[PDB]
Amino acid sequence: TMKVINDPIHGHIELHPLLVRIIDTPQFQRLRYIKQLGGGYYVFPGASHNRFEHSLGVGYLAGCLVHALGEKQPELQISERDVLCVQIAGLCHDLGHGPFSHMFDGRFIPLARPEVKWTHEQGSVMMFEHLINSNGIKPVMEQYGLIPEEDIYFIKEQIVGPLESLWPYKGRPENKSFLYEIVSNKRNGIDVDKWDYFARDCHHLGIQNNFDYKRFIKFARVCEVDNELRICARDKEVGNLYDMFHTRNSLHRRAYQHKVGNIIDTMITDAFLKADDYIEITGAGGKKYRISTAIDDMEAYTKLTDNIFLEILYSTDPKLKDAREILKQIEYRNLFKYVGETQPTGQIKIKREDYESLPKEVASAKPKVLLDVKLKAEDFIVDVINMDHVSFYKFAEQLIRVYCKKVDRKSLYAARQYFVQWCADRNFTKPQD
Amino acid sequence: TMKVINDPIHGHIELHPLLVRIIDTPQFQRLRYIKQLGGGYYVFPGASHNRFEHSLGVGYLAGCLVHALGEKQPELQISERDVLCVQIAGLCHDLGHGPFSHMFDGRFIPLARPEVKWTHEQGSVMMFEHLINSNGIKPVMEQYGLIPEEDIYFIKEQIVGPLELWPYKGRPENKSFLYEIVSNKRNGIDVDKWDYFARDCHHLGIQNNFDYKRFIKFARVCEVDNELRICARDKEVGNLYDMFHTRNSLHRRAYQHKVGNIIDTMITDAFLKADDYIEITGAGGKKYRISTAIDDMEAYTKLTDNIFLEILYSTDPKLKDAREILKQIEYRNLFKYVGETQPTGQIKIKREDYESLPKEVASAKPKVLLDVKLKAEDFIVDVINMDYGMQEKNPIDHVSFYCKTAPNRAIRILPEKFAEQLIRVYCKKVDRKSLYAARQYFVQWCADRNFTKPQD
Ligand SMILES: Nc1nc2c(ncn2[C@@H]2O[C@H](COP(=O)(O)OP(=O)(O)OP(=O)(O)O)[C@@H](O)[C@H]2O)c(=O)[nH]1
Ligand SMILES: Nc1nc2c(ncn2[C@@H]2O[C@H](COP(=O)(O)OP(=O)(O)OP(=O)(O)O)[C@@H](O)[C@H]2O)c(=O)[nH]1
Ligand SMILES: [Zn+2]
Ligand SMILES: [Zn+2]
């Protein structure tokens, strides 16, 4: 029962029955209703792709790499069981994403609940657990040779990292440390996750992809480094890697950090914040959750997708009028206006818990040339945008942009002044344009 | 100094301000929430694309073609005004599509209201009218040289055809060729098809062998039977064959996919079970159902693929049945394929008769009586058309060519064959006995009807 799925990036993807069973669940199929690039679709009409197809792709590539390593180096003792667990991890690494992907955990939850610590990865673990239990996957795992308790632990570790000196992982021993570099590779940012989305995003955006992932897989090997096992590239592949990094940079410059695309993300977020008190999502035991609290209950979170945009847009409730009106601004293309950009000096990083305060700080700033119209915190949006040792055998770490909700020439002028001053008060770089 | 949109199929698409204004409306942006291939996404994960981006592409290509014709043959007197009206028509030809595109007008409305005669094209006209009025587009049209009353008429005619010698009132007969750009019924060669062949191929992973740019570049208006028509250079004949083979591949591989079509009928089943209980607010606070929203454009504006998730995420006990079918789709417990047949040599099945077909099948009398009997609600009968209205033809016959030396007049003159109507039957009961039974009813029904005999 080896099922085959046609993908425009990878061609034929063969799926193990166990994977098919994980895929055919509400928890996984949910990913069909979550846009890969969030608000990017509103700037790039080719970018209609969702997390679902990306996740299949990552699961596929994860398998290809591990399987290839096992053939070339049977001394690594990569079992078929190891292969499946890595595939599953690749499949399920994005289960925890929320509406509009990175917009949700990167901005909405911070602004809505600054107290809480939340990442989509943590979400992926919770949702995976929920998926397993809700659909009786453990017996099916056993039926294909897996040992649920340790293997489920391994899968979770691949996704989120060590779960809390030593070898921190408990799902596999240190002699298989290389397996933890396939799906999510923290240290050098080279994993199959990135391979898929670079290729996929390029394909949909109309941007040229220079990296050849197959070639890289074909020439990859596990090799000794600092008395540790790591995945290593042949020296002949160095050009291919440069091409990868250039593709990455292009995607970030051209798409991920696009000026209007990011503005639209903050407008969508603004609408969610205005809707959060009034939207009800039913979770476990009939209990009711808000957009911002659905992350606390996986039954509710399952039903939280980009649909929430249209539920607000199509609503008639008077209580949702404000939220609805912002989404209508997007349709009519009356967007927030770009004021300017700056960076934090030093190794200083504005943190998520502080995001909510930033608009007030900006309005609190005192421009020396006092002006006619004064602006308040509600009129400002402050957007914080985040972001050679691979083994062989201009990058801004944080950008800060400010937008204004009032498009009046004088308000824009004013806003600029507040912004410039705020940068000065914080010893941030001085705005240009 | 006009706006540019990056598209993966066409590259840079330059948009006239007036087009930008039509695009930035709820009525147009609605197309972002309607899947091009409907239930095809549930089989082809690459096919996440929506009608919106397709519509930009068609608008763009419509403009390219007309503009190219005007440069090569200024004796045609194609104004800038003409160009814009054709672009707008290309932009807006799909405004009338409903949830899951062709599933909606092709199956749901027929099953829900067999009385009514509805096409997405008619919808596009109504929605266009609604778009114009709701967003004060007439003054803006005037501001860029258009004459709203006649030009709006022309645009609508390009989309739906004529209403009620020369049938068109939006442009005179000496510009008859303009009516062949966006929608060409006669020979099925228009910019609409060019975009979706390319776009669908790009998303499905199927190779596209037609080269639309080349065709545009060598296209010319030329005399045929004292009729002005768009004519291809004789050198382009291979390119055309490639187009028709691409079309055939897309249909065989994608549009007629077995499970994809099953899923379309499951979605439709859910809608039918939800239709009584879903309320959509239209004009003046009046409430409409999924099946009646087509009667009110304010309501229809809010009718998109979202309706799938509204049903899926619902808690109302009255929607339990509809909801349960959509859950079957998530769990991948689909209706079961019984078999396939054709009305070869027969009169073809019409939309108003779709609702009756499941009863006919259960009414059929198999010779070998089975242990269990089945009823009409257990059968789905799916009628698949390549192009519903049209006669079984060869479309190359209606293509005009020209030789370069005598470019003013048309030349005097191994593709695939069409099964222009397929009929499939699915069963809602998945147990061996019922499936066996269903097969028997089906085989008999084909016999009773002088349809082709089912194979495997
Ligand atoms: N199961 C499944 N298949 C998908 C999905 N998305 C795309 N597909 C593809 O669509 C095809 C049809 O769905 P299935 O019902 O699994 O197809 P099938 O081959 O008839 O399999 P059975 O019905 O189980 O015999 C699959 O073979 C896959 O190639 C998905 O989410 N789940
Ligand atoms: N206007 C508009 N632009 C879109 C749409 N879809 C994608 N885009 C692209 O998104 C870009 C940014 O949107 P705009 O608000 O037009 O931004 P802009 O190009 O800076 O134009 P202004 O904001 O009017 O100066 C556009 O230039 C288009 O290339 C759409 O539906 N409407
Ligand atoms: Zn990912
Ligand atoms: Zn179309």
Side-chain angles (χ1 to χ4, degrees), chain B residues 401-413 415-456:
Chain B
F401 294 89
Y402 75 88
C403 90
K404 187 171 65 158
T405 46
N408 280 313
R409 250 259 295 241
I411 292 182
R412 230 57 194 78
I413 47 107
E416 32 31 70
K417 22 181 146 121
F418 305 141
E420 286 286 333
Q421 194 176 90
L422 296 174
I423 295 156
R424 290 176 192 172
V425 171
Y426 326 123
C427 181
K428 302 192 189 170
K429 301 201 188 180
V430 301
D431 54 53
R432 252 263 285 108
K433 60 178 149 271
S434 307
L435 292 178
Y436 189 84
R439 181 62 175 183
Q440 302 318 320
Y441 286 94
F442 173 56
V443 170
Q444 187 63 54
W445 180 71
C446 292
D448 298 359
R449 205 89 188 224
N450 187 184
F451 289 161
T452 62
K453 189 154 219 119
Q455 307 211 72
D456 290 321

Side-chain angles (χ1 to χ4, degrees), chain A residues 226-237:
Chain A
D226 197 50
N227 294 192
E228 214 180 330
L229 298 194
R230 284 198 164 55
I231 305 184
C232 319
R234 76 178 302 167
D235 197 13
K236 207 141 184 163
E237 287 296 290

Side-chain angles (χ1 to χ4, degrees), chain A residues 96-134:
Chain A
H97 269 295
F100 301 93
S101 293
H102 288 291
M103 190 213 69
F104 196 74
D105 65 342
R107 183 178 172 83
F108 172 76
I109 295 299
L111 292 184
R113 301 170 74 187
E115 76 271 14
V116 162
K117 287 203 74 192
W118 172 260
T119 66
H120 72 269
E121 291 96 338
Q122 290 158 224
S124 298
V125 167
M126 290 170 71
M127 186 62 63
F128 179 62
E129 179 62 24
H130 178 56
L131 185 158
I132 296 310
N133 295 335
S134 299

Side-chain angles (χ1 to χ4, degrees), chain B residues 271-289:
Chain B
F271 283 17
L272 287 164
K273 291 194 172 38
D275 200 35
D276 289 341
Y277 313 107
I278 288 282
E279 281 185 336
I280 299 148
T281 300
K286 292 204 108 278
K287 298 231 169 189
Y288 294 89
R289 292 140 131 75

Side-chain angles (χ1 to χ4, degrees), chain A residues 36 51 54 58 93-94 97 193 197:
Chain A
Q36 182 83 173
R51 290 271 155 200
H54 163 60
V58 174
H93 77 292
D94 272 355
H97 269 295
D193 184 23
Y197 76 76

Side-chain angles (χ1 to χ4, degrees), chain B residues 68-191:
Chain B
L69 293 174
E71 283 290 353
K72 272 21 227 187
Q73 306 174 258
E75 69 267 22
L76 298 166
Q77 305 188 62
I78 289 159
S79 52
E80 154 198 295
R81 168 161 165 260
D82 289 327
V83 171
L84 266 170
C85 287
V86 174
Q87 280 187 295
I88 290 165
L91 258 200
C92 297
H93 78 292
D94 271 356
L95 279 175
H97 269 295
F100 302 92
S101 293
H102 288 291
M103 190 214 68
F104 196 74
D105 65 342
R107 182 178 172 85
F108 172 76
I109 295 299
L111 293 184
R113 301 172 72 187
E115 26 166 30
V116 162
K117 280 224 341 186
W118 169 260
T119 64
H120 71 270
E121 291 96 338
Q122 290 168 36
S124 296
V125 167
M126 291 170 72
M127 186 62 62
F128 180 62
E129 178 63 24
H130 178 56
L131 186 158
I132 296 310
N133 295 332
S134 299
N135 303 281
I137 297 299
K138 275 174 198 171
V140 190
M141 282 182 154
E142 283 178 348
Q143 164 180 357
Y144 293 106
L146 273 51
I147 297 167
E149 200 214 34
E150 52 177 322
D151 283 348
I152 281 166
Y153 209 92
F154 174 40
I155 291 163
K156 293 180 184 192
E157 286 173 323
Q158 289 183 76
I159 288 174
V160 76
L163 262 177
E164 217 89 335
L165 202 85
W166 182 237
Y168 294 110
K169 161 189 177 298
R171 287 291 186 283
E173 187 163 342
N174 64 287
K175 281 178 175 170
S176 60
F177 63 91
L178 288 188
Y179 286 90
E180 292 188 328
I181 291 156
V182 167
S183 178
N184 193 334
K185 290 303 172 70
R186 174 172 134 281
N187 69 351
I189 299 167
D190 50 48
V191 303

Side-chain angles (χ1 to χ4, degrees), chain A residues 13 40 80 93 96 130 149 171 236 238 253 277 318 337 339-341 359-360 362 393:
Chain A
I13 294 177
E80 293 319 285
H93 77 292
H130 178 56
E149 199 189 318
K236 207 141 184 163
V238 68
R253 258 187 289 96
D277 289 341
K337 248 60 217 153
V339 175
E341 189 169 329
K360 314 186 182 198
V362 166
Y393 75 86

